[PDB]
């Protein structure tokens, strides 16, 4: 009988009855009660905290012998060749309507431009807008990209690749060491290219964005700028972040895009919009790369624009937490940039360039742009979200907290359970 | 007797005397001594570390369906209408003296401007500087704010609110989704507004600062800029930080401002200066919003400037740690910004704007400013300071460290104490 | 006999044989085996994790009553006085060759400039390039530094110190409170200074870099810029980072530079290059401060440039991890900066400055530069790499994990070992 109380190896209270004294027995019983009470309260609290799925983050800065230079893409803030637009003004509103897929900016209904564009779309059903923008848009050529070098190696227009964005033709670089970097000298040729000011496209200069090669450029007002007549120096540093899965973080690794190119939030949004629009129309706008047939011009007014309006009005596409349609990615790469400027044509260099290009000194100040992109002296930086706890970690805390007061362990718990099993 | 050594549940050494052997008894005594010696040393060390009140910080990045756009405020780098200042030059030095409350920049004594300003203040005692600056300062009007939109919705001058700063009249916006943001097109009208160059106000352009709506703008050289004739794109991302109380961090939540608008370091400085000045003079400079009566002009020279000089000399107002007069706030919101530029009037748009405003092409280049502020694609970032330890955490470590060597617990400590109590 | 099993204070299973029952004995043996099996597996795992030398990083933001303003250095983007270069064009290629030590940019062999420079070097062996660049380079003077102030105190050209960089003469400031800072107004005098455009030096403006006073400026494309005719405002905040030693982090504190000025990565690279070159030639290029004799001009072509080519081609000098020749420093200071601009000469101030300097209005727009550098409202930020574990920490985890299941301690391990020793 007494062996049950005397043999239970938990520190507990062996002398509850073996003390053979009233005061000692009462004290021992009180201790036995209180120790386990505190232990169970603490363990309940600890389990409650665990069920919150806590996390912690860490910051580290690595460096490598050599590193990948992120891809860059460029576009001209004047989107159309002047002659092709001189007698064809409706093109502005046509392109605006077609680009609503990306820029998501509402058009005043029954506006003169909208009315004329609708009339033209009703008339010239077989007209090909995409071919027009490809042929008559911006273009890279010895007459446009005067100079360009990369880590001391010359590069040629053939090295770039074509891309479509709301600004028309856009060109990427490096598509799929400190100090050194990419250097360029554009000739925006402001007299040859033009744009509608009434639509707000008033500024002149080069708009470019930095992105990882796997990505598709975004722009939509997030791209950087560079003015005419000033040499702009841009310094960048790679930044990488990691997120934990939804139970702890917000990523959902299991989702995959129809292109199957891993995953990317903007790609998820594009695919979602393509999927939605395909239901309401048998064709997909070509600005979304390869989801199906390109719609005839009239379909843009007939179905596309109302569909986008409805999508935004009902928030059928969203990003952010796992509850959103396109949750955050497991891994992401950002390239923060800082900028500084210098007057590009110096008086001494101005005449030299004028002789080189057989053009007036006014033209040089009013047309040329020089850009330089370099890695900073500190190469790399990473942010990582840690799993604050797993099953083992909680058990480690459980044992220490349990042993703190009661001076017990799982073996003692098993022994106590064995004693209970006989009584039950 | 022997039950005391045999029954003490602490692992220790039960066989100190029960071993019935010299070597075993000596070994057991040595073990019993050494285990507790190491345990007590470790526990003392750990208590010492705890009394340092350690802390750790974490970084996280959240996102929401929609977010609040921070308030923005603007001012003109030319502060006074040209005609009102043409025959009234003393106004420059008068305003400088009055603004010493904010800009805290010393004035060379007995300077011609200072002498003339003192003479005028002695003469025109009843002159109202504040009314003058309100009436003749900068102003928002269809002639000044040519265009402005907010998330695609047009906005009108009536949407702004008036504010006083060292630059005279200043206007706020949004006072108390990615890509989209605020767009503006100012007409600085450099011919109509003017400023004293001898005082250093040589540059022309728009100066603005970004702050949470609850806050009061600061400027004092911390505001951003935007030049004339260039379209400036500004991208921002909300950053939030939290600090622990003085025993761990530096915050002192218990301090409350007389306006009772929660707390803010700059507000604390303003209130402290108002309190100090009110003692030495029955009136408070109006640039401090609502602490009492506004002082007559002469009082600025009589008391205010010497009082400010004394304040700075004796450091009667300070910020930073809890020892400072205005300690750091518990919660803070900052909006870091990056900037890039483009030439604003394009050759094609230049003529259009000239026709629109019936003004020369030179005027357009020399007067207009265009600004755009957008949220970045990543919305939110927060920094939080964690309590590295509370009472429970130290106890958890205490039990594990104690159990490591001696294999004991609080229950054993109680049992050991009970044995000691009988002997005592 | 039975005392061995009954007396072993480890919770384990005292009743393996004392149970006097088959089922109880089997259960107790199973428990004794399983508890220690799990414990040993967990302890092995934990030792494995420890041997990874884990680390964690923390971020904190402190503030002080006053703080040290970092040193700044400036250079002119036009490097040579126009007259001295008018009839001496070979100087451009000569300086390019000599500066190859720093800019590490390859020269096209047998180029006309290279041929003529080699001819001159063969002819004028005793010509002193360093004296030439010192005398005829950029210079600070009342004719060049029109104005400059520091925290409200006027400063004079005598306060700067001379330095040599690839841009020729360069001047430092502050060499070995919020809002207030450094203000300057340069006169680049674009007519008096000039540079070769064919070498790419086309832009005009001021190039400057921010560094701690102990450091030597780097430039090499990492320096900031500021254009002509625009007032540039620069805001900075001090950032400090701390790294752990190679076993945990990447620092190797034991390495010391020959100058013994503590340590710095760029200093390590400079010293390494000097050491390598000194072997292949008895003289060291003067751009490396004080490592020995300066080489005669011909030696630059004879030995230096081939030696640099070989160094780069064999990566004999490297930075980064401890495996690299110049590992990361233990402590580093960076000064990230953000920039904004305003049109410098306002119409009202333009005439005033023209009268002040007796120069045409065109000159003022085409020659003057204004800069201002200020500390942000948040002073200081530090990043620290923590030792995730020491010997004591692992022992703390070891005891808790051991006590979790087996309910044992080192004392029990000693008792078990004592029992084993007798059997052995």
Author numbering:
A (entry chain B), B (entry chain C), C (entry chain A): 38 to 213, 224 to 471
What does the article say, verbatim?
To reveal how hBASIC responds to Ca2+ removal, we prepared grids of hBASIC reconstituted in nanodiscs in the presence of 2 mM EGTA to chelate ambient Ca2+o and analyzed the sample using single-particle cryo-EM. Following extensive 3D classification methods, two predominant classes emerged, each containing between 15,000-20,000 particles. The overall resolution of both classes was lower than hBASIC in the presence of Ca2+, with both class 1 and class 2 having a global resolution of ~3.4 Å. In accordance with the electrophysiology data, we observed two distinct particle classes that differ in their pore conformations, which we thus refer to as ‘EGTA-closed’ (class 1), representing a non-conducting state, and ‘EGTA-open’ (class 2), representing an expanded, conducting state. In both the Ca2+-closed and EGTA-closed structures, this ‘glycine gate’ is impermeable to ions, with pore radii less than 1 Å and ~1.2 Å, respectively. Removal of Ca2+ promotes conformational heterogeneity in this molecular clutch. EGTA-closed resembles the Ca2+-closed conformation whereas EGTA-open is dramatically reorientated such that the positions of the L425 and N426 side chains are switched; N426 now facing the vestibule and L425 making contacts with the β1-β2 linker.
The bile acid-sensitive ion channel (BASIC) is the least understood member of the mammalian epithelial Na+ channel/degenerin (ENaC/DEG) superfamily of ion channels, which are involved in a variety of physiological processes. There is, however, a conserved architecture among other members of the ENaC/DEG superfamily. These trimeric channels resemble a chalice in which a large extracellular domain (ECD) connects to a slender transmembrane domain (TMD) via linkers at the membrane interface. In this study, we used single-particle cryo-EM to determine the structure of hBASIC in the membrane-like environment of lipid nanodiscs, confirming its global adherence to the canonical ASIC fold. By determining structures in the presence and absence of Ca2+, we identified a single Ca2+-bound, non-conducting conformation of hBASIC, as well as both conducting and non-conducting conformations of Ca2+-free BASIC, revealing unexpected Ca2+-dependent conformational changes.
